[PDB]
mmCIF file of C-alpha atoms in Angstrom:
data_model
loop_
_atom_site.group_PDB
_atom_site.id
_atom_site.type_symbol
_atom_site.label_atom_id
_atom_site.label_comp_id
_atom_site.label_asym_id
_atom_site.label_seq_id
_atom_site.Cartn_x
_atom_site.Cartn_y
_atom_site.Cartn_z
ATOM 1 C CA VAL F 1 139.648 78.699 49.323
ATOM 2 C CA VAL F 2 137.747 76.169 47.124
ATOM 3 C CA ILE F 3 138.386 75.895 43.383
ATOM 4 C CA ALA F 4 135.002 74.322 42.593
ATOM 5 C CA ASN F 5 134.899 72.033 39.533
ATOM 6 C CA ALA F 6 138.443 72.397 38.234
ATOM 7 C CA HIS F 7 138.024 69.381 35.908
ATOM 8 C CA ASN F 8 135.312 67.394 34.093
ATOM 9 C CA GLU F 9 136.738 64.021 34.995
ATOM 10 C CA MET F 10 137.320 62.899 38.585
ATOM 11 C CA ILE F 11 140.531 64.545 39.937
ATOM 12 C CA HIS F 12 143.479 62.393 41.078
ATOM 13 C CA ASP F 13 146.013 64.857 42.581
ATOM 14 C CA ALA F 14 146.224 68.386 44.126
ATOM 15 C CA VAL F 15 149.816 69.683 44.594
ATOM 16 C CA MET F 16 151.273 73.222 45.087
ATOM 17 C CA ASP F 17 154.570 74.950 44.254
ATOM 18 C CA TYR F 18 157.067 75.400 47.069
ATOM 19 C CA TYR F 19 155.482 78.802 47.675
ATOM 20 C CA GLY F 20 151.826 77.768 47.839
ATOM 21 C CA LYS F 21 150.921 80.503 45.342
ATOM 22 C CA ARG F 22 150.486 78.267 42.299
ATOM 23 C CA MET F 23 148.751 74.863 42.275
ATOM 24 C CA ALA F 24 148.512 71.873 39.898
ATOM 25 C CA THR F 25 145.539 69.533 39.314
ATOM 26 C CA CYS F 26 145.462 66.308 37.337
ATOM 27 C CA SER F 27 142.577 64.051 36.359
ATOM 28 C CA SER F 28 141.406 61.162 34.204
ATOM 29 C CA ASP F 29 140.667 63.560 31.350
ATOM 30 C CA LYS F 30 144.351 63.048 30.763
ATOM 31 C CA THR F 31 144.894 66.737 31.540
ATOM 32 C CA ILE F 32 146.670 68.772 34.201
ATOM 33 C CA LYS F 33 146.023 72.354 35.234
ATOM 34 C CA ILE F 34 148.217 75.131 36.673
ATOM 35 C CA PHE F 35 146.799 77.651 39.130
ATOM 36 C CA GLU F 36 147.176 80.830 41.148
ATOM 37 C CA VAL F 37 145.753 81.003 44.658
ATOM 38 C CA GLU F 38 145.239 84.180 46.744
ATOM 39 C CA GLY F 39 143.117 84.621 49.860
ATOM 40 C CA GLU F 40 140.318 82.757 48.094
ATOM 41 C CA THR F 41 141.048 83.454 44.412
ATOM 42 C CA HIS F 42 141.875 80.897 41.730
ATOM 43 C CA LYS F 43 143.242 82.040 38.374
ATOM 44 C CA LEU F 44 143.413 79.203 35.856
ATOM 45 C CA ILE F 45 146.436 79.368 33.568
ATOM 46 C CA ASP F 46 147.447 76.692 31.042
ATOM 47 C CA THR F 47 146.115 73.125 30.836
ATOM 48 C CA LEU F 48 148.860 70.523 30.243
ATOM 49 C CA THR F 49 148.107 67.989 27.493
ATOM 50 C CA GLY F 50 149.947 65.139 25.769
ATOM 51 C CA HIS F 51 148.940 62.374 28.183
ATOM 52 C CA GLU F 52 147.068 59.528 26.515
ATOM 53 C CA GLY F 53 145.700 57.837 29.631
ATOM 54 C CA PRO F 54 144.504 59.124 33.014
ATOM 55 C CA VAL F 55 147.075 61.234 34.860
ATOM 56 C CA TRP F 56 147.814 59.831 38.272
ATOM 57 C CA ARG F 57 150.074 62.030 40.341
ATOM 58 C CA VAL F 58 152.188 65.161 39.829
ATOM 59 C CA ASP F 59 155.003 66.920 41.723
ATOM 60 C CA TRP F 60 156.479 70.417 41.852
ATOM 61 C CA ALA F 61 160.251 70.722 41.430
ATOM 62 C CA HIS F 62 162.332 73.002 43.649
ATOM 63 C CA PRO F 63 162.283 76.664 42.485
ATOM 64 C CA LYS F 64 166.048 76.182 42.375
ATOM 65 C CA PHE F 65 165.613 74.949 38.762
ATOM 66 C CA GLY F 66 162.739 77.266 37.919
ATOM 67 C CA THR F 67 159.102 76.261 37.532
ATOM 68 C CA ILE F 68 158.727 72.606 36.706
ATOM 69 C CA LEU F 69 155.841 70.181 37.348
ATOM 70 C CA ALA F 70 156.037 66.460 36.587
ATOM 71 C CA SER F 71 153.063 64.187 35.822
ATOM 72 C CA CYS F 72 152.703 60.433 35.450
ATOM 73 C CA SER F 73 149.830 58.662 33.707
ATOM 74 C CA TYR F 74 148.372 55.233 33.034
ATOM 75 C CA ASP F 75 149.968 55.730 29.600
ATOM 76 C CA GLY F 76 153.177 54.367 31.163
ATOM 77 C CA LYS F 77 154.851 57.739 30.791
ATOM 78 C CA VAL F 78 155.788 60.636 33.082
ATOM 79 C CA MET F 79 156.208 64.075 31.615
ATOM 80 C CA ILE F 80 157.668 67.320 32.867
ATOM 81 C CA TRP F 81 156.904 70.832 31.640
ATOM 82 C CA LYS F 82 158.615 74.152 32.486
ATOM 83 C CA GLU F 83 157.158 77.668 32.474
ATOM 84 C CA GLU F 84 159.690 79.886 30.655
ATOM 85 C CA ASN F 85 158.143 83.310 29.971
ATOM 86 C CA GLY F 86 154.882 82.632 31.808
ATOM 87 C CA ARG F 87 153.943 80.143 29.038
ATOM 88 C CA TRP F 88 153.825 76.380 29.755
ATOM 89 C CA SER F 89 155.675 74.024 27.407
ATOM 90 C CA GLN F 90 156.589 70.308 27.498
ATOM 91 C CA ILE F 91 160.327 70.066 28.207
ATOM 92 C CA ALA F 92 160.974 66.314 28.323
ATOM 93 C CA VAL F 93 159.037 63.038 28.223
ATOM 94 C CA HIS F 94 160.078 60.033 30.331
ATOM 95 C CA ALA F 95 158.599 56.688 29.248
ATOM 96 C CA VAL F 96 160.860 53.743 30.122
ATOM 97 C CA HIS F 97 158.332 51.614 31.966
ATOM 98 C CA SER F 98 155.970 49.208 30.362
ATOM 99 C CA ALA F 99 152.646 49.968 32.080
ATOM 100 C CA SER F 100 151.026 52.623 34.237
ATOM 101 C CA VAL F 101 153.243 54.808 36.435
ATOM 102 C CA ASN F 102 151.439 55.632 39.687
ATOM 103 C CA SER F 103 153.873 57.897 41.526
ATOM 104 C CA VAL F 104 156.547 60.436 40.788
ATOM 105 C CA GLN F 105 158.262 62.680 43.337
ATOM 106 C CA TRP F 106 161.276 64.948 42.964
ATOM 107 C CA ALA F 107 164.565 64.555 44.855
ATOM 108 C CA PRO F 108 165.662 67.251 47.420
ATOM 109 C CA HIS F 109 167.307 70.015 45.366
ATOM 110 C CA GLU F 110 170.525 69.141 47.204
ATOM 111 C CA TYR F 111 170.597 65.883 45.217
ATOM 112 C CA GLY F 112 169.721 67.847 42.084
ATOM 113 C CA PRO F 113 166.961 67.864 39.400
ATOM 114 C CA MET F 114 166.174 64.217 40.098
ATOM 115 C CA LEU F 115 162.875 62.412 39.614
ATOM 116 C CA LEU F 116 161.907 59.057 41.125
ATOM 117 C CA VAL F 117 159.516 57.037 38.974
ATOM 118 C CA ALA F 118 157.613 54.010 40.281
ATOM 119 C CA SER F 119 155.578 52.076 37.726
ATOM 120 C CA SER F 120 153.071 49.285 38.018
ATOM 121 C CA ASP F 121 155.425 47.591 35.625
ATOM 122 C CA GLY F 122 157.000 46.425 38.856
ATOM 123 C CA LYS F 123 160.091 48.535 38.279
ATOM 124 C CA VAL F 124 161.264 51.972 39.413
ATOM 125 C CA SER F 125 163.414 54.559 37.616
ATOM 126 C CA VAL F 126 165.624 57.417 38.763
ATOM 127 C CA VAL F 127 166.191 60.215 36.285
ATOM 128 C CA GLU F 128 168.194 63.415 36.509
ATOM 129 C CA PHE F 129 168.060 66.029 33.760
ATOM 130 C CA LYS F 130 171.498 66.956 32.377
ATOM 131 C CA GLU F 131 172.036 69.822 29.934
ATOM 132 C CA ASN F 132 171.489 69.022 26.237
ATOM 133 C CA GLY F 133 168.295 67.133 27.064
ATOM 134 C CA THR F 134 169.377 63.464 27.013
ATOM 135 C CA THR F 135 169.350 61.990 30.538
ATOM 136 C CA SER F 136 171.090 58.977 32.066
ATOM 137 C CA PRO F 137 168.277 56.742 33.415
ATOM 138 C CA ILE F 138 168.604 54.267 36.268
ATOM 139 C CA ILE F 139 166.101 51.426 36.579
ATOM 140 C CA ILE F 140 165.888 48.634 39.118
ATOM 141 C CA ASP F 141 163.198 46.014 39.797
ATOM 142 C CA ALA F 142 161.428 46.675 43.096
ATOM 143 C CA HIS F 143 158.302 44.573 43.540
ATOM 144 C CA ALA F 144 156.393 41.502 42.427
ATOM 145 C CA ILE F 145 153.007 42.565 41.125
ATOM 146 C CA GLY F 146 154.009 46.223 40.764
ATOM 147 C CA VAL F 147 154.953 49.529 42.447
ATOM 148 C CA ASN F 148 152.547 52.124 43.874
ATOM 149 C CA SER F 149 154.668 54.729 45.732
ATOM 150 C CA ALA F 150 158.244 55.990 45.808
ATOM 151 C CA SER F 151 158.762 58.685 48.438
ATOM 152 C CA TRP F 152 162.301 59.966 49.113
ATOM 153 C CA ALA F 153 164.393 60.222 52.300
ATOM 154 C CA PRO F 154 165.952 63.594 53.312
ATOM 155 C CA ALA F 155 169.545 64.445 52.370
ATOM 156 C CA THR F 156 172.504 63.254 54.439
ATOM 157 C CA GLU F 157 175.920 58.529 49.135
ATOM 158 C CA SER F 158 173.359 58.125 51.976
ATOM 159 C CA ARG F 159 170.560 58.614 49.420
ATOM 160 C CA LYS F 160 167.477 56.678 50.542
ATOM 161 C CA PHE F 161 163.850 56.212 49.416
ATOM 162 C CA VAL F 162 160.914 53.986 50.368
ATOM 163 C CA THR F 163 158.831 51.942 47.934
ATOM 164 C CA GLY F 164 155.315 50.618 48.364
ATOM 165 C CA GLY F 165 154.544 47.245 46.883
ATOM 166 C CA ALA F 166 151.705 45.883 44.783
ATOM 167 C CA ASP F 167 152.829 42.736 46.582
ATOM 168 C CA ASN F 168 152.315 44.150 50.112
ATOM 169 C CA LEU F 169 155.998 44.969 50.710
ATOM 170 C CA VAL F 170 157.575 48.269 51.857
ATOM 171 C CA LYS F 171 161.273 48.656 51.107
ATOM 172 C CA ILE F 172 164.260 50.954 51.721
ATOM 173 C CA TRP F 173 166.831 51.717 49.072
ATOM 174 C CA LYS F 174 170.210 53.451 49.488
ATOM 175 C CA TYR F 175 172.536 54.565 46.711
ATOM 176 C CA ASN F 176 175.858 52.785 46.246
ATOM 177 C CA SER F 177 178.727 54.068 44.086
ATOM 178 C CA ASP F 178 180.057 50.520 44.031
ATOM 179 C CA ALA F 179 176.749 49.006 42.914
ATOM 180 C CA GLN F 180 176.315 51.868 40.421
ATOM 181 C CA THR F 181 172.663 52.089 41.522
ATOM 182 C CA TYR F 182 170.274 52.076 44.472
ATOM 183 C CA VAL F 183 170.180 48.671 46.147
ATOM 184 C CA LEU F 184 167.808 47.229 48.715
ATOM 185 C CA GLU F 185 168.124 47.724 52.452
ATOM 186 C CA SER F 186 164.976 46.943 54.454
ATOM 187 C CA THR F 187 161.887 44.943 53.530
ATOM 188 C CA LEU F 188 159.428 45.863 56.262
ATOM 189 C CA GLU F 189 156.453 43.489 56.074
ATOM 190 C CA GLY F 190 153.179 44.388 57.748
ATOM 191 C CA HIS F 191 150.246 44.808 55.385
ATOM 192 C CA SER F 192 147.997 41.901 54.401
ATOM 193 C CA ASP F 193 146.919 43.586 51.146
ATOM 194 C CA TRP F 194 148.556 46.010 48.696
ATOM 195 C CA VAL F 195 150.690 49.000 49.702
ATOM 196 C CA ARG F 196 148.700 51.914 48.284
ATOM 197 C CA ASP F 197 151.140 54.623 49.438
ATOM 198 C CA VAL F 198 154.304 55.288 51.482
ATOM 199 C CA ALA F 199 155.779 58.692 52.330
ATOM 200 C CA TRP F 200 159.083 59.461 54.075
ATOM 201 C CA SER F 201 159.386 62.350 56.547
ATOM 202 C CA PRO F 202 161.865 65.270 56.570
ATOM 203 C CA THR F 203 161.767 65.447 60.395
ATOM 204 C CA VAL F 204 165.497 65.402 61.237
ATOM 205 C CA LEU F 205 164.822 64.668 64.936
ATOM 206 C CA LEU F 206 166.628 61.759 66.639
ATOM 207 C CA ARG F 207 164.622 59.018 64.918
ATOM 208 C CA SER F 208 163.439 58.405 61.336
ATOM 209 C CA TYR F 209 159.689 58.255 60.622
ATOM 210 C CA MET F 210 158.070 56.475 57.676
ATOM 211 C CA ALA F 211 154.409 56.031 56.789
ATOM 212 C CA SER F 212 152.795 53.154 54.944
ATOM 213 C CA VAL F 213 149.161 53.012 53.843
ATOM 214 C CA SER F 214 147.493 50.070 52.073
ATOM 215 C CA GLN F 215 144.464 48.280 50.695
ATOM 216 C CA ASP F 216 144.734 46.319 53.921
ATOM 217 C CA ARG F 217 143.087 49.494 55.263
ATOM 218 C CA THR F 218 145.706 50.442 57.869
ATOM 219 C CA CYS F 219 148.752 52.643 58.382
ATOM 220 C CA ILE F 220 152.017 51.263 59.735
ATOM 221 C CA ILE F 221 154.353 54.007 60.969
ATOM 222 C CA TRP F 222 157.884 52.621 60.632
ATOM 223 C CA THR F 223 160.133 54.191 63.288
ATOM 224 C CA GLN F 224 163.869 53.461 63.308
ATOM 225 C CA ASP F 225 166.691 55.205 65.219
ATOM 226 C CA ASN F 226 170.059 54.376 63.641
ATOM 227 C CA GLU F 227 171.871 52.142 61.117
ATOM 228 C CA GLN F 228 171.744 49.067 63.349
ATOM 229 C CA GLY F 229 168.303 49.842 64.768
ATOM 230 C CA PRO F 230 165.484 47.876 63.136
ATOM 231 C CA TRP F 231 162.265 49.629 62.085
ATOM 232 C CA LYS F 232 159.470 49.372 64.657
ATOM 233 C CA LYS F 233 156.153 48.362 63.123
ATOM 234 C CA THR F 234 153.324 50.402 64.644
ATOM 235 C CA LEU F 235 149.603 50.239 63.977
ATOM 236 C CA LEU F 236 148.230 53.764 63.685
ATOM 237 C CA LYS F 237 145.296 52.108 65.481
ATOM 238 C CA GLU F 238 144.359 48.505 66.328
ATOM 239 C CA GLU F 239 141.247 48.668 64.142
ATOM 240 C CA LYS F 240 140.397 49.008 60.450
ATOM 241 C CA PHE F 241 139.459 52.282 58.797
ATOM 242 C CA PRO F 242 136.075 51.534 57.071
ATOM 243 C CA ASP F 243 137.578 51.987 53.569
ATOM 244 C CA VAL F 244 140.952 51.716 51.866
ATOM 245 C CA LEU F 245 143.782 54.182 52.364
ATOM 246 C CA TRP F 246 145.224 55.988 49.388
ATOM 247 C CA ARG F 247 147.578 58.723 50.475
ATOM 248 C CA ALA F 248 149.878 59.591 53.359
ATOM 249 C CA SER F 249 151.534 62.983 53.605
ATOM 250 C CA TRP F 250 154.084 64.511 55.963
ATOM 251 C CA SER F 251 153.785 68.076 57.226
ATOM 252 C CA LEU F 252 156.732 70.415 56.816
ATOM 253 C CA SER F 253 157.405 70.724 60.545
ATOM 254 C CA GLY F 254 155.753 69.514 63.721
ATOM 255 C CA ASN F 255 155.657 66.157 61.944
ATOM 256 C CA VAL F 256 151.888 65.561 61.620
ATOM 257 C CA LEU F 257 150.242 62.794 59.592
ATOM 258 C CA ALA F 258 148.001 63.571 56.642
ATOM 259 C CA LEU F 259 146.119 60.362 55.904
ATOM 260 C CA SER F 260 143.874 60.630 52.872
ATOM 261 C CA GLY F 261 141.493 57.708 53.214
ATOM 262 C CA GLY F 262 139.150 56.221 50.671
ATOM 263 C CA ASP F 263 135.962 56.611 52.662
ATOM 264 C CA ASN F 264 136.495 60.040 51.168
ATOM 265 C CA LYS F 265 137.606 61.476 54.530
ATOM 266 C CA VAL F 266 140.993 63.022 55.441
ATOM 267 C CA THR F 267 142.383 62.414 58.930
ATOM 268 C CA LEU F 268 145.238 64.137 60.802
ATOM 269 C CA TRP F 269 147.437 62.412 63.387
ATOM 270 C CA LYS F 270 150.126 63.246 65.983
ATOM 271 C CA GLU F 271 152.357 61.181 68.287
ATOM 272 C CA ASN F 272 151.601 62.068 71.926
ATOM 273 C CA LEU F 273 154.373 61.960 74.587
ATOM 274 C CA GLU F 274 154.399 58.159 74.959
ATOM 275 C CA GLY F 275 154.793 57.281 71.281
ATOM 276 C CA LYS F 276 151.266 56.411 70.172
ATOM 277 C CA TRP F 277 148.907 58.442 67.955
ATOM 278 C CA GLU F 278 145.888 60.736 68.329
ATOM 279 C CA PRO F 279 143.733 63.129 66.201
ATOM 280 C CA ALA F 280 144.119 66.927 65.863
#
């Protein structure tokens, strides 16, 4: 179902609506594109523009609040646009960070219309969209050099999300009505280089599963069982993948690992009966 040459500039992200019927591509050309996919067809609708620097990542909001797609660019700003009347418009612009923003994912509709922003400005922001338009932002420093990922943890307070460091550190953050904002929990060390990406699973089974990919060219699957329980570092393999590792994605169900390399190859992984990993 290829959509050959969607952009002019190299593409940095390919995400779909909750109903895999409409896509969203973003590139360096500072532009994002909306799509329609059927059997093998690709209808190109609008092309989102207002981004000064290369767009990095984008994320589809839950249909619960209509059609909304958020994008983050080098321009140190993340922007969201809705699709009222089949015509794409820019609803709000979030630019609190001072430097590139490399990741932006939406919170489980349960939580609400929340967006988690992680900038290379070393900080991270949490923003929910009220009514009138003016939101109440929440920012908290998260890493030394910077921040590269900010995946969320499923619903359960009890609001958690993992961060990937520019300083090689993976962290866990849980809300706190007494602290007024998300505070640190874990600080799982493991990578020798920078944490390129970290995604948290929705697999509600007995134990929690977290993925961490990095310039150190390895994935460390962080498995923990309960509050007490510490996270068990686990090398996806006791060798190095020839190139870096940029993305890690969790399948809806069946909990399978989508590990987008850098050697330009995508690999899939599963945890056999023991607790190790194998292809698919």
